[PDB]
Design an enzyme around this catalytic site. Structure first.
Site, short mmCIF file in Angstrom:
data_model
loop_
_atom_site.label_atom_id
_atom_site.label_comp_id
_atom_site.label_asym_id
_atom_site.label_seq_id
_atom_site.Cartn_x
_atom_site.Cartn_y
_atom_site.Cartn_z
NE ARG A 67 -5.81 -1.20 8.66
CZ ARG A 67 -4.57 -1.47 8.27
NH1 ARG A 67 -4.11 -2.75 8.28
NH2 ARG A 67 -3.81 -0.48 7.80
NE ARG A 74 7.40 -2.72 6.62
CZ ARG A 74 6.16 -2.28 6.86
NH1 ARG A 74 5.55 -1.50 5.92
NH2 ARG A 74 5.53 -2.58 8.01
CE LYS A 103 -2.57 -1.17 3.66
NZ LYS A 103 -1.85 -2.48 3.80
N1 AP5 Z 1 -7.99 1.72 9.72
C1 AP5 Z 1 -7.38 1.25 10.86
N2 AP5 Z 1 -8.13 0.70 11.83
C2 AP5 Z 1 -7.62 0.16 12.99
N3 AP5 Z 1 -6.31 0.08 13.20
C3 AP5 Z 1 -5.43 0.59 12.25
C4 AP5 Z 1 -5.92 1.19 10.99
N4 AP5 Z 1 -4.84 1.56 10.30
C5 AP5 Z 1 -3.73 1.28 11.01
N5 AP5 Z 1 -4.13 0.69 12.17
C6 AP5 Z 1 -3.18 0.25 13.25
O1 AP5 Z 1 -1.89 0.62 12.76
C7 AP5 Z 1 -1.05 -0.54 12.54
C8 AP5 Z 1 -0.15 -0.30 11.32
O2 AP5 Z 1 -1.02 0.01 10.17
P1 AP5 Z 1 -0.29 0.17 8.77
O3 AP5 Z 1 1.01 0.89 8.91
O4 AP5 Z 1 -1.28 0.63 7.78
O5 AP5 Z 1 0.19 -1.32 8.48
P2 AP5 Z 1 -0.42 -2.44 7.49
O6 AP5 Z 1 -1.72 -2.36 6.80
O7 AP5 Z 1 0.08 -3.62 8.28
O8 AP5 Z 1 0.58 -2.30 6.24
P3 AP5 Z 1 2.18 -1.98 6.15
O9 AP5 Z 1 2.51 -0.47 6.23
O10 AP5 Z 1 2.88 -2.90 7.03
O11 AP5 Z 1 2.44 -2.52 4.65
P4 AP5 Z 1 2.05 -1.86 3.21
O12 AP5 Z 1 0.91 -2.55 2.58
O13 AP5 Z 1 2.05 -0.40 3.23
O14 AP5 Z 1 3.33 -2.46 2.39
P5 AP5 Z 1 4.68 -1.68 2.00
O15 AP5 Z 1 4.45 -0.85 0.83
O16 AP5 Z 1 5.43 -1.14 3.18
O17 AP5 Z 1 5.52 -2.97 1.41
C9 AP5 Z 1 5.80 -4.08 2.29
C10 AP5 Z 1 7.22 -4.54 2.00
O18 AP5 Z 1 7.17 -5.26 0.72
C11 AP5 Z 1 7.98 -4.56 -0.26
N6 AP5 Z 1 7.21 -4.57 -1.50
C12 AP5 Z 1 6.28 -3.66 -1.89
N7 AP5 Z 1 5.71 -4.01 -3.07
C13 AP5 Z 1 6.27 -5.18 -3.42
C14 AP5 Z 1 6.22 -6.05 -4.59
N8 AP5 Z 1 5.34 -5.76 -5.58
N9 AP5 Z 1 7.03 -7.14 -4.59
C15 AP5 Z 1 7.88 -7.44 -3.59
N10 AP5 Z 1 8.01 -6.64 -2.50
C16 AP5 Z 1 7.27 -5.51 -2.42
C17 AP5 Z 1 8.33 -3.19 0.32
O19 AP5 Z 1 9.66 -2.76 -0.18
C18 AP5 Z 1 8.25 -3.41 1.86
O20 AP5 Z 1 9.52 -3.95 2.32
C19 AP5 Z 1 -2.10 -1.60 12.36
O21 AP5 Z 1 -1.50 -2.90 12.53
C20 AP5 Z 1 -3.14 -1.26 13.39
O22 AP5 Z 1 -2.73 -1.59 14.73
MG MG Z 2 2.14 1.38 4.93
#
Ligand code: AP5
Ligand code: MG
Ligand code: CA
Ligand code: CA
Ligand code: CA
Ligand code: ZN
Length: 217
Positions: free
Chosen positions: A88, A127, A13
């Protein structure tokens, strides 16, 4: 261009959102990023959120919806916005429908970056995040030029505290269980646009662009 970006933890995302906001000129509104900024500031929002975030649980709906309602009232959302990680839950989505009706900022589409659960541990554990700008890297899939250092600003990379294996498992379980009702909600509205997130980063983005080019002024 009024958009939601949804997907399981690790689906990409932030990676996609960063590209969207630079190319289409809309603000990036990530609830995770908001909660972490609050925690860094040691504000009361941050203290309340932290208990849940550190365990990998969802922050309760009521305070999450409140922070988003106030954020979407800013002048920078008047021509479009990119919500990332919110809604979410189905209750969050119901609340957002009503907020956006009152605000006159109805969603165009919900982009769902689809990625199998089984691939996500490896995405999250590998990551690395920049301590200065928050851009994300991956040790294998998207490495920095100079190991341990951000390409943009020379900042030290770190691991997010909730990217440890135990907490990642809880985050996957928690979010999988909330995802289907949310997908059902948006599929019934017709807004859901699914993108295959298990492609090269630029190929996922090309598919995103195929949709967004139809929405730009
Ligand atoms: N609406 C809500 N309601 C209630 N609670 C809430 C909430 N929103 C947040 N919260 C609370 O906040 C916490 C954190 O929320 P939040 O920070 O939103 O975490 P999340 O949804 O777990 O998602 P991430 O930021 O971990 O991952 P992302 O999808 O952004 O992936 P990224 O691009 O970094 O990429 C991941 C990795 O993969 C790699 N990557 C990216 N794309 C690819 C690809 N195509 N191929 C291979 N690797 C890739 C990247 O380099 C990176 O290393 C929640 O757990 C909860 O407690
Ligand atoms: Mg994120
Ligand atoms: Ca306002
Ligand atoms: Ca390609
Ligand atoms: Ca393809
Ligand atoms: Zn940086």
């Amino acid at each position: 261009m009024n958009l939601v970006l949804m997907g399981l933890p690790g689906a990409g995302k932030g990676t996609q959102g960063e590209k969207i906001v630079e190319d289409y000129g809309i603000p990036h509104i990530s609830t995770g990023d908001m909660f972490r900024a609050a925690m860094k500031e040691e504000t009361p929002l941050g203290l309340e959120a932290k208990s849940y975030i550190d365990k990998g649980e969802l922050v309760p709906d009521e305070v999450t919806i409140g922070i988003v309602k106030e954020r979407l009232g800013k002048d920078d959302c008047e021509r479009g916005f990119l919500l990332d990680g919110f809604p979410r839950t189905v209750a969050q989505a119901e609340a957002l429908e009503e907020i956006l009706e009152e605000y006159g900022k109805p969603i165009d589409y919900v982009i769902n970056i689809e990625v199998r659960k089984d691939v996500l541990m490896e995405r999250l554990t590998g990551r690395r995040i920049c301590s200065v700008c928050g851009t994300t890297y991956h040790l294998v899939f998207n490495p920095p030029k100079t190991p341990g250092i951000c390409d943009k600003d020379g900042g030290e990379l770190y691991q997010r505290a909730d990217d440890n294996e135990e907490t990642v498992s809880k985050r996957l379980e928690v979010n999988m269980k909330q995802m289907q009702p949310l997908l059902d909600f948006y599929s019934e509205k017709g807004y859901l646009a699914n993108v295959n997130g298990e492609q090269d980063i630029e190929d996922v983005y090309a598919d995103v662009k195929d949709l967004l080019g139809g929405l730009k002024k």
